[PDB]
Structures are given as structure tokens and as C-alpha cells.
């Protein structure tokens, strides 16, 4: 498992014929990440958290491979529908659902819906009578385990089908022991519910998986421990996972050029043609950090990179060791797949940087 | 006074239009523009369209005779579509991009700003003979001379730059400066204006005759805690100064926040409730990824109005992402609200929707012209 990276020569040839900034996504890498999870965690169907990356080619690839989808809004389920994706392969997993979104959900025939609060029941019962609902469980957001069953019975009472439960394990706190303890709590709640008159049939595990193999744990071995725990505890139940960052994050790169240089201070400044109102919006909204590769040879000094807009805050990196760069030189930013261009804007009238598909280019064929 | 929708009005607008939407009063954009012609006559207006690019606003302004401060090819293209000639534009981004400079070339935009030598040859090659103004660092409204910022040459290198640009075939037209956002006092201008006199006076003796001076923006708008500047008084102190120091030169300003800020309102619905915490929690259908993005990007607090009586408890408001960052207000005194009730945010005109996104696939809240709605007619009556 390698992260998707473009070589220096690939960045130059691509930039010759696509004007910067642009993103480059690798469908091959997305597939690899999909097949990895399937190989090591076979018992979880995949609900793709498309909020992370909603690019149509990535989305089509995923429907091709069998992925279901995790929809947050009417506009998400609209994009999917034009690609031929049915609402039976959608779960509406926004906790608080818009009216416009519940309408969409009825029209498209979305099967599964999730909730943590009893104010949410009152409105799904009117909008989508008899819909299959899962409760989100905190083991902020989520619902106390001890209120989980009362919440499904309230749902069942208003004419919704109590179908099951989701938790989310945080990446920071991610461990095999953690998933194993949540599955135990889930198993108890199933058994308890059954004696309560409800047959729960579906269990949604969340995402919160990381990566590329240059990172902390042995994830293949971890998914196999979780998978073995699903097979012993939930051999008849439909199990799901909803990866988002996991699917895409290391599957996209940004190519962007130096459009100005400021040489006045001790520190050189370099203005790029993408910034915090475009793809680097991740910095503000995801609190994330993107590896930056400048390509000159020569001596390095501490250097600031700025974005292209009239705002003070359009600064991406400071005291970053980089060589001497000219205008028109190209830099490359990896880990640009998730929660980046989702947050981009046309602030200052600027265009959204397009996403180019790597497999539809000579450079991809050239890898041989 | 500021454009503020009645409660009566929020209710009927919400009947006909789905939340969230914004509501622009073109009358108010016109008062604002006129107020500035009345009290700061000597200052020609380059509307900074980044604050609000709404097409009906822009056309109003074009019709009143305003010029435009243009920041990218996309902002030029919109103006060209509305019939606005390039003579009406200044490309006032100090670091310009190739698509921008070709657009500028195509649409014959006359003016450009710059604060560095690496910009010059990029402009000479792309529009020869263009009028340039050098952008210059000055004491900000905070009283700092910050030379480590994104924009502005030091006063010390201002004239050489301008000469360096004349040496590349560009017309050395003048000087601009920006004191920054939300000026609560007139000190930064009077002080900066005087620094500018000196460079013209020093340039006369070099033999470059500078014809134009752009004084930037920074004019205030009320926020969550109001505004206590006397704008008329502030504007006349600046005007007064431009007449003693610059009797014989063309003087321009670049308002953005001021022009539209007080002309726009957001109508948004409470869509969920959380009652497990000690504070009640209200989820609205606009978030930090939408128009409230100005919390993140502009460090700004908007003034919120809930309607109802008989309660007030400190309450929390969050956005529709349902995210850790998607929190709008905490400890806000609000009555008991229910799903379906409408809230109002006022002074939502500037640096608001421009930074909004389709994250989660939500829509960009549309911007409704109030003068076309039936609620306006009621007003004239």
C-alpha cells in the first residue's frame, strides 16, 4: 500500500497542458483501498462517506465495485441518482435532517436513516413513514447506550422500523480493543431488544480507519481481529462500515504554481495560485496538514507560502525549508483527497480547481 | 438605519421561499452609496466586489456610476456580462495570475496595483502601457507598522518600484494603501494621507507626476455588539483631509464591507433540538460551511434574533453539518424554540456568502432581492 504520489516529471508534463491549479485523483488507488478493506474486513458492507470526496468518477468507480453510499443531504442524493445509484444503496446518516432532504429521501426511496435524538423521530415518521432507522450510540453526538432501546421503541411506535445501531470509533482512539468492546455492547443491545419485541438486523460500525502503509499500526491485522469478532458475535446480522477519509485521502494530489515571489525580508515568500479559500480550506475546517514538495535543487531557507487572494490569512506554510523558487515553478501537495475541495469556494471570483483523472492521461499508461 | 426584516416579514417570506435564504435590499445599498457621495465627495468609489458579488447589486452600482475593484478573471467576467466596461475596473490584486492578466488584457482594464518587482515584468509583458499604482504599507488602524505581511511595499521602496515600472513601459500613475478592516477611528487615514503627500511631493522632484491616489477601504459595519462610530463625522474628517493635502489629484476609495453589509439578512430555520445537555441546543440549517463562514474566515460575530417570549436560557446554536466546528453561538440568551421556527441574522451582507461551500452537498443559500417581493410594496404603503 503506497500513497498516491506524482513524480517530478509527471508534474511538469501534466502542467504543460492543464492550467494550474488542478487536482489529480488516482482511481487505481481508490480501488486498492476499497479492495483492501474487503480483503481484510469481509463482513462489513461499505457505506462510502461521500462528503469527503464527491467526485463523480470516484463515485462511479465505487458503484461499479459494489459500494453503498452515505448521504448527508438532498444534494448528495441528487448527485448519486444521476449516476444511476438507487436509494436502496443509500443511508441518510445526517443526524439532524433538513426538510428538503427528507423529501428527497422519500422520492429517491432511501432505505436506511440514522438518528440520536427523539425530536428527530417526530419528523421522520411524518416524512418517511415506515422507514428503517438505526440509532447512533456514544460508547456531543451519539446517544447514551442506556437510552438506545427506548429510542428505537419510540421510533417503532411512531411507525418506523427499528432496524439497528451505529457507533463511530474515533481515529485518535482507534484500537482493536475499542471496536471489540463496541461490538460487545452492540451484541447485548441486540439480544435485549429482541426480548423487547424488536428484531435488529443491521449494524453500522463507522469509519475511523486511517490510510498508505507509512503509518503507525498493522491495519491488515487489526481489521482481521475486528472481522473475527464480527463473525463470532454477528454471524446473521448485516454489518457496515462507512469510510470516508480512508477511501480517498491519499488518492489525490494538488499541482499549483508559484505566481509571485516576495524577497524583501529574511524570509522569502511564494504566492501560489491555490489557497485557504480553495483546496487548502482543510487547514481551517479539518485542522489538517499537507506534505508540500518543492522541486528545485540548491540550498534551502525558511520560507512562507501564500495563496492567491486579497486576504491577510491566506497563508499556508511558514518557516518551511524550501529552495529558491521562480515564477511558473510548480509545487505538489499530497494527501489532498478528503475534506479539501469539498470546502472550496469562489471567493474573490476564483474558479474551483478541477479534479483530473490520472488513469485518463498518457502519464498513467507511461507507468510500465 | 440598517436594513432589518420585520418578524411579520420573516414569516411570509419563509412561506414562499425555502430556508435558508438571504434577502438584499437594493434601496439600502443605494442609501449607503449615496451617503458616501454626500459625506466623502472627493473619494471616487471602486466597489470591492469580493464582499458581495451579487449580480443585481453590481448592476445597481454600475448604474449609479461606481467603478469596481476587481480581484480575478472571474470577477471581471461577471462585470463584463452585465455590460460594465474595463475602464471602470482596477485589477487590485497585488499578485496576479495568468488567467487574470489575459482577462484584464481582453477587457481592456486600465488600472493595476503592485507591491513587488517580480510583478512588473508580468504586467509589462501582458498589458503594456498600463496605469499602475504602487501599494504601500502604512500604520494600520491598530497602530502597527507591519512589514512582514502579505501586501504592501515599504514607503522607503515605493518610488523606486514606480520608477522601475516606468522603466518597463508602464505608466506610473499613483499610490494606494490599505489600513485594514473595521476602522473605529480616523487616525490611520489622516496619517497615511500625509505619508502619501510626501511621496507625491518627492516624486514631483524626481519628475514623475502622480495623478491618482487610492485610499483603500476599512469603513465599518455593525456587528454583534453594534457600532458606535459616527460614519458621517468619520467620513467628513477624511474628506476634509483630502482637500487640504490633495486638491489637485484624483482620489479613490475601495469600500466593500460598508457597501453591502447592512443591506443583507439571513432567514434560517431551526431544524433539530438537543435536550440532553444542561443548555438547550438548536441546529439551524445554515452553518460554518455556509454564510457563517465569516466566523472562521473574518473572525466576525453576527447579530442573531430569535422570536418568542417568556423564556430565556443560555442556549447553543449549531450548523447543519452537525460537526464539532459547526457551532455558531454558545451561552446565547434565547427563548424556547421549536423545530420549524425562524431566526434572523442581520448585517449579513459582506464576506459572508462569498466564502460559502457545498460541503455535505448543501445548497448555497440564494440571495433574494427584496424590492421584487410583495413585502416591499407593503412597506411603501
Amino acid at each position: 500500500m503506497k500513497n498516491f504520489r506524482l513524480s517530478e516529471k509527471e508534474v511538469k508534463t501534466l502542467a504543460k497542458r492543464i492550467p494550474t491549479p488542478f487536482l489529480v485523483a488516482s482511481l487505481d488507488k481508490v480501488e486498492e483501498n476499497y479492495q483492501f478493506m474487503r480483503r481484510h474486513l469481509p463482513r462489513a458492507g461499505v457505506f462510502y462517506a461521500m462528503k469527503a470526496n464527491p467526485t463523480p468518477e470516484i463515485l462511479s468507480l465505487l458503484a461499479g465495485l459494489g459500494s453503498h453510499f452515505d448521504v448527508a443531504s438532498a444534494g448528495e442524493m441528487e448527485i448519486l441518482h444521476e449516476l444511476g445509484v438507487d436509494g436502496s444503496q443509500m443511508i441518510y446518516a445526517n443526524p439532524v435532517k433538513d426538510a428538503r432532504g427528507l423529501k428527497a429521501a422519500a422520492d429517491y426511496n432511501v432505505r436506511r436513516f440514522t438518528f440520536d435524538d427523539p425530536s428527530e423521530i417526530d419528523k421522520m415518521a411524518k416524512a418517511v413513514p415506515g422507514a428503517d432507522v438505526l440509532v447512533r450510540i456514544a460508547v456531543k453526538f451519539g446517544a447514551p447506550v442506556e437510552e438506545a432501546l427506548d429510542l428505537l421503541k419510540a421510533a417503532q411506535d411512531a411507525g418506523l422500523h427499528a432496524m439497528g445501531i451505529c457507533f463511530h470509533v474515533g481515529s485518535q482512539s482507534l484500537s482493536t480493543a475499542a471496536y471489540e468492546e463496541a461490538l460487545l455492547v452492540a451484541r447485548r443491545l441486540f439480544d435485549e431488544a429482541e426480548e423487547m419485541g424488536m428484531h435488529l438486523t443491521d449494524l453500522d460500525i463507522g469509519g475511523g480507519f486511517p490510510v498508505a502503509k507509512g503509518l503507525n499500526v498493522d491495519l491488515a491485522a487489526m481489521m482481521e481481529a475486528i472481522n473475527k469478532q464480527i463473525d463470532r458475535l454477528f454471524p446473521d446480522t448485516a454489518v457496515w462500515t462507512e469510510p470516508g477519509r480512508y477511501m480517498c485521502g491519499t488518492a489525490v494530489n494538488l499541482v499549483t504554481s508559484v505566481i509571485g515571489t516576495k524577497t524583501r525580508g529574511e524570509q522569502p515568500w511564494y504566492i501560489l495560485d491555490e489557497g485557504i479559500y480553495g483546496c487548502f480550506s482543510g487547514i481551517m475546517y479539518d485542522h489538517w496538514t499537507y506534505p508540500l514538495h518543492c522541486f528545485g535543487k540548491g540550498n534551502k531557507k525558511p520560507s512562507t507560502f501564500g495563496g492567491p487572494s486579497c486576504d491577510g490569512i491566506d497563508v499556508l506554510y511558514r518557516d518551511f525549508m524550501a529552495p529558491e523558487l521562480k515564477i511558473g515553478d510548480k509545487v505538489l501537495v499530497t494527501e489532498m483527497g478528503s475534506y479539501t475541495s469539498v470546502s472550496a469556494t469562489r471567493f474573490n471570483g476564483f474558479y474551483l480547481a478541477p479534479t483530473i483523472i490520472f488513469e485518463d492521461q498518457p502519464e498513467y499508461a507511461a507507468r510500465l
Side-chain angles (χ1 to χ4, degrees), chain A:
Chain A
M1 298 281 93
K2 338 177 177 226
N3 90 109
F4 174 58
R5 202 184 152 159
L6 289 183
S7 68
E8 207 197 312
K9 275 181 288 253
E10 292 169 334
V11 167
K12 289 304 184 275
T13 58
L14 279 161
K16 220 122 68 202
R17 56 177 210 281
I18 303 107
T20 63
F22 56 86
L23 292 152
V24 180
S26 179
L27 269 33
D28 270 24
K29 171 64 189 158
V30 171
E31 187 170 8
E32 275 180 60
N33 294 348
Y34 190 88
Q35 274 169 21
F36 190 91
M37 181 154 271
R38 299 284 327 152
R39 203 177 284 130
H40 304 293
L41 182 69
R43 278 302 314 284
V46 176
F47 284 141
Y48 176 49
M50 53 166 286
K51 59 176 161 126
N53 202 301
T55 294
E57 298 86 326
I58 288 152
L59 253 32
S60 295
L61 174 75
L62 284 176
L65 302 171
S67 192
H68 285 41
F69 297 89
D70 170 10
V71 152
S73 90
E76 287 198 343
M77 58 225 303
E78 267 162 27
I79 290 156
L80 246 23
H81 185 248
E82 299 180 315
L83 298 175
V85 180
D86 203 56
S88 63
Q89 304 179 307
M90 285 184 209
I91 179 172
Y92 196 6
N94 205 6
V96 184
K97 298 163 199 79
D98 180 8
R100 201 202 317 275
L102 278 170
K103 187 213 223 79
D107 295 332
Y108 289 131
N109 258 281
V110 179
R111 208 180 151 186
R112 307 183 162 80
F113 303 75
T114 76
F115 75 116
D116 61 41
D117 198 275
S119 66
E120 194 65 24
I121 293 166
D122 202 323
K123 74 169 118 149
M124 290 149 94
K126 278 139 212 185
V128 256
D132 307 70
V133 293
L134 307 96
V135 179
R136 299 154 61 107
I137 295 304
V139 54
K140 236 37 125 261
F141 289 89
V145 156
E146 291 299 338
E147 185 136 296
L149 299 190
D150 290 352
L151 238 27
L152 284 165
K153 193 152 138 206
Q156 189 188 52
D157 271 359
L160 302 174
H161 188 51
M163 193 184 51
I165 284 146
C166 27
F167 47 80
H168 212 284
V169 177
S171 46
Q172 277 191 6
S173 8
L174 153 88
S175 69
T176 97
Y179 270 109
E180 283 188 26
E181 189 255 5
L183 293 168
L184 280 167
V185 163
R187 191 46 180 153
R188 183 198 92 98
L189 286 168
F190 269 51
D191 286 350
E192 236 150 61
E194 194 71 87
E195 289 309 314
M196 197 159 319
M198 314 184 269
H199 182 57
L200 306 190
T201 193
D202 280 70
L203 179 55
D204 174 14
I205 249 75
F209 284 109
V211 301
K213 29 131 149 270
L215 196 59
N216 189 335
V217 70
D218 176 347
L219 188 58
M222 212 172 87
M223 282 177 164
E224 286 175 1
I226 293 164
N227 188 257
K228 183 187 204 288
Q229 201 67 356
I230 293 154
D231 267 326
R232 76 175 279 259
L233 269 41
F234 293 94
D236 61 330
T237 278
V239 175
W240 303 95
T241 180
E242 84 208 359
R245 195 201 300 288
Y246 167 86
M247 278 308 328
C248 277
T250 51
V252 188
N253 288 17
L254 182 67
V255 171
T256 176
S257 16
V258 177
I259 60 169
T261 74
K262 248 133 154 21
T263 37
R264 233 151 230 145
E266 185 69 27
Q267 197 156 299
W269 273 53
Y270 296 124
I271 305 309
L272 315 178
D273 54 20
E274 187 70 346
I276 45 93
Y277 293 104
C279 277
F280 291 98
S281 44
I283 290 164
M284 305 272 126
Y285 286 129
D286 206 43
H287 285 76
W288 238 72
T289 192
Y290 308 95
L292 167 57
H293 307 99
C294 323
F295 282 121
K297 301 308 302 174
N299 290 324
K300 300 193 216 299
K301 35 269 149 192
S303 314
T304 294
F305 290 75
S309 77
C310 316
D311 204 303
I313 70 155
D314 207 340
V315 173
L316 321 170
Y317 299 85
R318 328 186 97 113
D319 312 328
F320 177 94
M321 295 298 292
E324 175 159 301
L325 303 178
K326 291 165 64 163
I327 291 162
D329 288 0
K330 306 277 167 273
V331 301
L332 177 68
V333 186
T334 65
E335 290 182 9
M336 273 280 333
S338 323
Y339 304 114
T340 43
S341 84
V342 299
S343 305
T345 82
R346 306 239 7 239
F347 182 81
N348 257 202
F350 278 110
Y351 306 134
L352 300 171
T355 132
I356 292 302
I357 301 298
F358 186 62
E359 289 78 8
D360 300 325
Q361 311 294 311
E363 288 81 22
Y364 173 65
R367 290 179 179 203
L368 87 194

